[PDB]
Design an enzyme around this catalytic site. Sequence first.
Site, PDB file in Angstrom:
ATOM      1  N   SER A 111     115.872 -71.437 -16.519  1.00 48.43           N
ATOM      2  CA  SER A 111     115.540 -70.767 -17.767  1.00 48.43           C
ATOM      3  C   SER A 111     115.303 -71.809 -18.848  1.00 48.43           C
ATOM      4  O   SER A 111     116.027 -72.805 -18.929  1.00 48.43           O
ATOM      5  CB  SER A 111     116.652 -69.813 -18.197  1.00 48.43           C
ATOM      6  OG  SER A 111     117.881 -70.501 -18.333  1.00 48.43           O
ATOM      7  N   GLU A 143     128.175 -76.058 -15.124  1.00 54.46           N
ATOM      8  CA  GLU A 143     129.301 -75.138 -15.229  1.00 54.46           C
ATOM      9  C   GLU A 143     129.616 -74.563 -13.857  1.00 54.46           C
ATOM     10  O   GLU A 143     128.716 -74.011 -13.210  1.00 54.46           O
ATOM     11  CB  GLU A 143     128.987 -74.017 -16.203  1.00 54.46           C
ATOM     12  CG  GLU A 143     130.105 -73.008 -16.379  1.00 54.46           C
ATOM     13  CD  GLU A 143     129.640 -71.746 -17.079  1.00 54.46           C
ATOM     14  OE1 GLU A 143     129.013 -70.893 -16.418  1.00 54.46           O
ATOM     15  OE2 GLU A 143     129.902 -71.606 -18.292  1.00 54.46           O
ATOM     16  N   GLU A 164      96.305 -72.877  -1.024  1.00 55.29           N
ATOM     17  CA  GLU A 164      95.220 -71.942  -1.305  1.00 55.29           C
ATOM     18  C   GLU A 164      95.472 -71.199  -2.609  1.00 55.29           C
ATOM     19  O   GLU A 164      94.553 -71.004  -3.418  1.00 55.29           O
ATOM     20  CB  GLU A 164      95.086 -70.961  -0.140  1.00 55.29           C
ATOM     21  CG  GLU A 164      93.886 -70.043  -0.197  1.00 55.29           C
ATOM     22  CD  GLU A 164      93.714 -69.246   1.084  1.00 55.29           C
ATOM     23  OE1 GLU A 164      94.587 -69.350   1.971  1.00 55.29           O
ATOM     24  OE2 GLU A 164      92.708 -68.516   1.206  1.00 55.29           O
TER      25      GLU A 164
HETATM   26  N1  LIG Z   1      83.754 -60.436   9.191  1.00 57.67           N
HETATM   27  C1  LIG Z   1      84.950 -60.991   8.963  1.00 57.67           C
HETATM   28  N2  LIG Z   1      85.178 -61.648   7.831  1.00 57.67           N
HETATM   29  C2  LIG Z   1      86.439 -62.131   7.766  1.00 57.67           C
HETATM   30  C3  LIG Z   1      87.437 -62.022   8.699  1.00 57.67           C
HETATM   31  N3  LIG Z   1      88.590 -62.657   8.262  1.00 57.67           N
HETATM   32  C4  LIG Z   1      88.272 -63.122   7.082  1.00 57.67           C
HETATM   33  N4  LIG Z   1      86.979 -62.852   6.731  1.00 57.67           N
HETATM   34  C5  LIG Z   1      86.329 -63.240   5.493  1.00 57.67           C
HETATM   35  O1  LIG Z   1      86.093 -64.623   5.533  1.00 57.67           O
HETATM   36  C6  LIG Z   1      86.051 -65.137   4.177  1.00 57.67           C
HETATM   37  C7  LIG Z   1      86.996 -66.305   4.071  1.00 57.67           C
HETATM   38  O2  LIG Z   1      86.956 -67.031   5.306  1.00 57.67           O
HETATM   39  P1  LIG Z   1      88.266 -67.587   5.969  1.00 57.67           P
HETATM   40  O3  LIG Z   1      89.422 -66.666   5.782  1.00 57.67           O
HETATM   41  O4  LIG Z   1      87.975 -67.953   7.382  1.00 57.67           O
HETATM   42  C8  LIG Z   1      88.633 -69.084   5.080  1.00 57.67           C
HETATM   43  P2  LIG Z   1      88.878 -70.365   6.297  1.00 57.67           P
HETATM   44  O5  LIG Z   1      89.915 -69.909   7.268  1.00 57.67           O
HETATM   45  O6  LIG Z   1      87.536 -70.706   6.847  1.00 57.67           O
HETATM   46  O7  LIG Z   1      89.488 -71.598   5.555  1.00 57.67           O
HETATM   47  P3  LIG Z   1      90.989 -71.820   5.120  1.00 57.67           P
HETATM   48  O8  LIG Z   1      91.298 -70.757   4.135  1.00 57.67           O
HETATM   49  O9  LIG Z   1      90.993 -73.164   4.501  1.00 57.67           O
HETATM   50  O10 LIG Z   1      91.838 -71.735   6.355  1.00 57.67           O
HETATM   51  C9  LIG Z   1      86.386 -63.928   3.300  1.00 57.67           C
HETATM   52  O11 LIG Z   1      85.188 -63.206   3.062  1.00 57.67           O
HETATM   53  C10 LIG Z   1      87.196 -63.069   4.264  1.00 57.67           C
HETATM   54  O12 LIG Z   1      87.221 -61.724   3.853  1.00 57.67           O
HETATM   55  C11 LIG Z   1      87.188 -61.328   9.900  1.00 57.67           C
HETATM   56  O13 LIG Z   1      87.960 -61.131  10.844  1.00 57.67           O
HETATM   57  N5  LIG Z   1      85.889 -60.837   9.943  1.00 57.67           N
END
Ligand SMILES: Nc1nc2c(ncn2[C@@H]2O[C@H](COP(=O)(O)CP(=O)(O)OP(=O)(O)O)[C@@H](O)[C@H]2O)c(=O)[nH]1
Lengths: 427, 427, 50, 189, 428, 439
Positions: free
Chosen positions: E129, E60, E243
């Site tokens: 829909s 439409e 993801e």
């Molecule tokens: N201590 C930290 N933990 C982090 C940080 N960023 C993420 N995480 C933790 O890491 C965990 C997941 O890891 P990632 O985000 O690195 C997943 P990754 O990038 O390895 O894989 P993809 O998702 O396939 O890209 C989860 O617990 C997040 O909360 C950070 O800067 N510091």
Amino acid sequence: MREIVHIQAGQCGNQIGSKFWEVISDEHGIDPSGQYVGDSDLQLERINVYYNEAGSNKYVPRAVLVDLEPGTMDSVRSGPFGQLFRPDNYVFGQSGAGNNWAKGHYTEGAELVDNVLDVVRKEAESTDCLQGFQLTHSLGGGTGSGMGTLLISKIREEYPDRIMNTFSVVPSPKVSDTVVEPYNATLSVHQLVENTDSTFCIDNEALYDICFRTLKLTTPTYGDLNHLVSATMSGVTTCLRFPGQLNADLRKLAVNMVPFPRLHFFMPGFAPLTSRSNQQYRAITVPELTQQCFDAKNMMAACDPRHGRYLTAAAIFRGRMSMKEVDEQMLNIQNKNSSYFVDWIPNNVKTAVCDIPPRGLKMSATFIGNSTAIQELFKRISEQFTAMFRRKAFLHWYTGEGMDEMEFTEAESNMNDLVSEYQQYQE
Amino acid sequence: MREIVHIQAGQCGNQIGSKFWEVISDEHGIDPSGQYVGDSDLQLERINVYYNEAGSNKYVPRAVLVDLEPGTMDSVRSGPFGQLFRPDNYVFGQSGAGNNWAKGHYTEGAELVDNVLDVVRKEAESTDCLQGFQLTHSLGGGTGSGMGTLLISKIREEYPDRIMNTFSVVPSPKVSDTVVEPYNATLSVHQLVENTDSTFCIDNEALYDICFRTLKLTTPTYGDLNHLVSATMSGVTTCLRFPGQLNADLRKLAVNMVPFPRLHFFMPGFAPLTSRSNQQYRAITVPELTQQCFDAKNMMAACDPRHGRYLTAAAIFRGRMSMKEVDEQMLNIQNKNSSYFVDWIPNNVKTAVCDIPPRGLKMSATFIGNSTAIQELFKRISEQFTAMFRRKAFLHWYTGEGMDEMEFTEAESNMNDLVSEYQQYQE
Amino acid sequence: TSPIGRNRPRHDSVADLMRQDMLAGVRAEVDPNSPTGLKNARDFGHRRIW
Amino acid sequence: MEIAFDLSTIFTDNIQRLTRTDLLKYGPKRYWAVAQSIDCLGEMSSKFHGWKRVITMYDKIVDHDEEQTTYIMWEKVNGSKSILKGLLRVGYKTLYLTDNEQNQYMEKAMCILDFFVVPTEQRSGNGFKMFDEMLKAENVTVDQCAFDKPSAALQQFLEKYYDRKDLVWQSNKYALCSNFFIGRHPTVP
Amino acid sequence: MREVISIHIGQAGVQIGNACWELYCLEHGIQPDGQMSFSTFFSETGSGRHVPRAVMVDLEPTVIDEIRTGTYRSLFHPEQLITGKEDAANNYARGHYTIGKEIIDLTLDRIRRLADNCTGLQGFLVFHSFGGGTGSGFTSLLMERLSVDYGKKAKLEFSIYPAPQVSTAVVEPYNSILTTHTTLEHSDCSFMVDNEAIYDICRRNLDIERPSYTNLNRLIGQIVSSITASLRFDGALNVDLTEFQTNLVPYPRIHFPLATFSPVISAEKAYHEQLSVAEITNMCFEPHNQMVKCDPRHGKYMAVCLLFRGDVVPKDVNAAIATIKTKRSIQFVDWCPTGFKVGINYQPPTVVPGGDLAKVPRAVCMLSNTTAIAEAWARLDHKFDLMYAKRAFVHWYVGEGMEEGEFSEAREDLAALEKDYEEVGVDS
Amino acid sequence: MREVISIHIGQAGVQIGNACWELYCLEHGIQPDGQMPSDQSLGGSDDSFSTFFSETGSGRHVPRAVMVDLEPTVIDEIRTGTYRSLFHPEQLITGKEDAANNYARGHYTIGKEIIDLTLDRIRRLADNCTGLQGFLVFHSFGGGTGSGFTSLLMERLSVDYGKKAKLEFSIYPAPQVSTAVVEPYNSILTTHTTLEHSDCSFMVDNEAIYDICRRNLDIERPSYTNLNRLIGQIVSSITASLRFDGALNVDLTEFQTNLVPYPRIHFPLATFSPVISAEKAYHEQLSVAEITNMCFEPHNQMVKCDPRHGKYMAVCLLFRGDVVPKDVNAAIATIKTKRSIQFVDWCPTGFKVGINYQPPTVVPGGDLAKVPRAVCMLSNTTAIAEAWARLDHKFDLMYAKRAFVHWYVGEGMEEGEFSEAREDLAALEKDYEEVGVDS
Ligand SMILES: Nc1nc2c(ncn2[C@@H]2O[C@H](COP(=O)(O)CP(=O)(O)OP(=O)(O)O)[C@@H](O)[C@H]2O)c(=O)[nH]1
Ligand SMILES: Nc1nc2c(ncn2[C@@H]2O[C@H](COP(=O)(O)OP(=O)(O)OP(=O)(O)O)[C@@H](O)[C@H]2O)c(=O)[nH]1
């Protein structure tokens, strides 16, 4: 003479590595532009361990930044120390692994590990005498976990005798933010046990607990957690870069710590962690650093050391302090906590004193504990893995990338052996 | 070598303690930030009596500040010497005791007394050789009068041999400002009698009279009263911190002034108290200091010593002086006032001459008096208590926290027993 | 309008906490006319007598 | 105190006027230096003043419902290093004002929300330059501005450079000068 | 770098697309005429115009004509606005076999042209829909052709599910049952939305007595913007579409998540509310806050995705998740110990001028894969059985090329899907 | 964090709360729209405005108040007034029909319809606060809503919270100035709830404040706004200690401990002493002694009763502003020397003194002059028994002929409740008579 290649995988690993390089540049007086703005001749004495020479008084870190998603790579490039790293060391893919171990290992990491190695080898064969590698990653993710294990296997095949260190963030249920992260962690531990010389287990829940109780931070961010991990990393490899009254490199720590080849999982720590209010009203002495290093609340892993027996311990002190005080403090710790130390090892603590304290700190101490309590994290991970694997909860995503169901059974059985071996020496 | 632990309870106790620490830091040359800026080596020689240390030329008082009302903690922290105290030493509850002895002694303060004892012990074993404790509180409130007595009993249970000094601000009818203060005072006097080695009874009316007639203060606020009390505090313990020709510590004063165990209620004082007009019209010599110490107007308790013979007296002098003058002045006081001293005790006055006077004063003397006139304050308190308890005026507030009327009757009977004991030696 | 970046996630509070030498220990003066100022002057302050 | 960037390549003047639009343009993603400097100055001001929270933040400024402008004093130190000297955050706000003799006013007045100089970099005429630059920037005189809880020091600083003392304190914890010549009182005294 | 194609089919899908693109233009600062991060939704031309990566298709031409004469005349590519001659008239067969074939080739050519112009294609966003004829049959045909052509590319389709009681057509159950087969085999993640639930949300939370379709479309656009914000706004804990699917979809057929937006509140009440992370997380799980007329308490959660926006701190998120997991009413399946996939972003949601939403400082879009959604399929099963026991309007379908066996096959397929949910919701 | 929830019930309670919250907004520097323009005040005296006002994410401050009325006229006047954007929209609770000046209607019939919503809002307020000190209830004895709904709500608050302090300020009926014809019934019925479920009930008369306004403020024709402003000044003086710091503070628990001798003797008087016109403050020193002496003059009490005919039991002097304790000690000394001011023999000390360092805040357009110091004397005296006796006599005259009993029995009330409340108030009068006898 003892150069080290640093590799960061995934967002967690990349952010931790960025904070680590900021901390190291602060320690060695490296201008964020790459220049040297230090004030002592000791910083340049062993600056070759972590940094390369760019000629015009510029020091580029010996770091390889890898991620399957360019977003984190660009975020690293746009940070305060983005201009530090060499552009050719940036190794970014097209799309992230999507928290899939199979995606990050078998296909998406497979057609990128070649480019990763093409620069890891370039950095390794550009050194006078390579000491080893260090990896930062997260076991819960897809990119970090899977690609880190694949790269670990490739490097161990290429460099069988060098020291392979990994600073891996272990997932915990209390701060879980992923549905399939136990699968990735269980798949990663299989390779970590077999192809590493020392794996420093780090947990986000313990870091939150430290920042909340000890530092009394009202609103902790990932910057704070990464700074804690960076301080631990700098403390571990401080005897390579500065003189000390009792030197201890990575290989010395490995020899003194691991009793058996696969018992190389450690709990890190840091001594002078003090709140803002208590900074002025606390006397920073060797005893205080000792009981804070051996305090259960200061460990950067969720598991409590009081639930197991220490196999070996290592406290790397930084700053000017008498060796008699350090030795008597370790003797007091051994005698008081005799129930938490294995009786078949006469002396457990491998002390080391470094002359140069961290910037702004009078003295410091980095703790590395090899306790059977580490088995708690793997027991929890195995419980979650079995709970989801009893029903084939999310396995179609992994099977779509070519990995079969048999691998999951082998990974769980092999990781279950690791738990038993730590329990073997725990009474 | 002889360290002293200080405790502050209630609003009056906290303010008096803040003034006392200000005066002590003035004497020891301690910067209000905790640093040492003293110009003499004598001040720092025995700074460990009242101050711990934090290494970088910073000293933290061995003081425990407690109050069930956090508002007083914030007020103390915001004071001129607020950041001198250690943050961990602040122990506070949820809300004030509401001028209820029963609350602070049984529920509200009994919840917090465990934490208070914990921090007090942590400070106590931190000392090389503890001498004892000194507590500042008010008998007319709930928090001070009840919880401080509970803590006194607990400490005396824990450390039966250490000295215990209390500087309690007893209520008076002339400047009374609390309805239920007779109950709190009568309940507190029993504990003060039982578990104290030397109680220095202080009265608000006497302090106001001193400020009005001696110092000629037009508008005497609480700061002036607290300063006079703090001057007495510093004068009592001057021989433990500075050398002198005749040294007397707290144990010496307790031995000299206590003939019988229950007669340890003293009258404080101060010698160089003079108005601003007559600063140059008077010579501060040993005879003048002695006369003004033994004058009835200068004494910091409302009771008139002229109606009661002294049991024992103690004038602790300071500054350079001759001990012939001091001895002959004490002999003159003993002789000319033979009716004001007990005959059965050949010598009532005990002397001590420290060699360091307060900053700005050529010489000073602190008077301590174990007169039999102490019975007057308790006579007034017992009169008020009997008048209120004849009809159970406000007894429901106390009985709502678990107290009993038999407790009130026992406290009144024991307080009258103490009054009769003091009266027994009158004539 | 346009997307707005945030600086709070970038804050590193631990960096200031490690450097004990970087502590100031200096507090601002309270307003004398404010009730806290009157309390400080009267209940905690005192007049010189000698 | 010290910022690890060469602010000369971004800022045009030692005292740069940073309105909300300027801060939005200078996001932390590519211009981390300005945001970090603003946050550091705000944290230092809060710590000095004993406040339990920071009232001057880049994030708090940009997302505020009404426009504000910030003045930052810096100086050259090295090739990639600069030093921070002071902070000054101001903005226009509507105020419910009450003058002498209980006269009620309601007029738009310019507020001095934050005005701080680094404690080790105080004196030497600092702060006066920022305040004069502000006044010349938006042609506002002291007679038409408002002070938020003027400190004893601002109360003196304005006394010793504008001679403007004996201020009147409004009910909203704002102190204004005795110059209420705006007129048009909504309520008769 | 991270591009996504959005396709709007039928009147409902096209109007939801109008709301979505208004929201995206507001978010990225793009003027309605196209003049001015944005690379996800918009393609920048050499002259400076930004054109959306959207294909508006409908048999439409009325609504597309409204677009082509409205404020967004200059925004969309003129060849991307695809129209037919006459609508499907609430007929699945007319939109699938009879009239859909007229423009399926042109639609696929436009989609292929859009896909070839982007190097970082992430997936598809199909808006339609179920109850309509176009949005059911033509969406079925187009999405099956897309699945054949592309395959591994993500296919996230947003559908307006028929309400349990509120209806605007008498043959809605037939079309919905017919499209159940296609939305189960081809789509990778199907977010169904109920008009009645959004009406209840607007009546209760926003205190709107007479909501229109504009408000419903604005909430749906907010949901889609929250879903796709991780691809174009930097923040901690980014969540990619792959993801998203990996964490949310446990089984190949269990790909029907719910949707909600907790910080929906009236403007007047917004300024007097804290709207903390814990509060918004708690009211995400309210049974009356979901945008499908189903009770999540009856079912058991299998996977929950929480995409926080704005001023959010990860420790607050962890505390909120712990509090949620402590609650007994919020029940998860035993075989999912870690049921939460948390994503955070630094870009707060934008407020549409004249809209019903206020300027909250933080926002969250809870996307739950729960078994409680089978109640809606049971309702449609009852409706279809009642309407097919007598074959009320089957002749209109069989007269347009469709066979009588299609109805039975679709009913069996939806019954099998309901049985799959019933057998997967049980504990181990 | 010391913080208190205030409840305003009925037209009188809501109208009083208007002035009370205007005063609070003036004191804490909070605009009528909920904004706090002082940026530094948010980071400064945090405990000051946290007592009365909450805080949101946008920087606005929401009063911790629940204004409830069975008819929406006054609440809608608020919602269309200056402070329409200050209060939380869900904290202003309305019905559709009032109690029609009937206790039974406000208690059972119209009360039970919205008592649940009111309790839900109060509980939501209490959950947000962490340091709840107590409750401030504002109502009127002679009304229908302010009597019945208050009686219905106080018992539920007592059974829900319990140990929290329930301080209620009410407008007691005047001996002669009465605006209702059945208010003795409502007052007698609410005597039961103000005696048991309350902690410290403050009585206020309209005629007394009218006389105070005439004598001091020099206004011959005052209205309800002035009375509400004075009551707001009283409540602000009472609660000043929680939100401001000063020497010798007095919080709610200290107040109740000092001023309430016996469980049933909790009906203190109230008087804000330094009430004077602007044209008279210039000719006065306004020192501590004179503002303390004006407290005990019968012409300054805000209850139409003569304190001379009774005996003070406990007196709570809450000074504020530039006050030093030695002047206060002299003031109580002089008061004790006075033979006319007779205390009980069983209270040797009956003065509980509280001092604050925040001076009273003057409301623009008000009749109260700016003063350096102020005192809010609050005495538990036996002279209020005569006001109770007057009310009891009026109730007896009304109830002898059963004048309006059917209006009450037609709404769920039993006829015996009148006798029960009459006996309860007689027992209270007997208690006040037998507490003052010398021992
Ligand atoms: N201590 C930290 N933990 C982090 C940080 N960023 C993420 N995480 C933790 O890491 C965990 C997941 O890891 P990632 O985000 O690195 C997943 P990754 O990038 O390895 O894989 P993809 O998702 O396939 O890209 C989860 O617990 C997040 O909360 C950070 O800067 N510091
Ligand atoms: N001080 C003061 N007294 C008031 C005010 N409004 C009413 N009153 C008094 O309150 C008494 C009781 O009447 P209301 O308060 O109107 O009764 P109510 O509580 O509203 O109950 P309903 O009549 O059922 O609505 C009257 O005798 C009035 O004198 C006011 O604004 N201030």
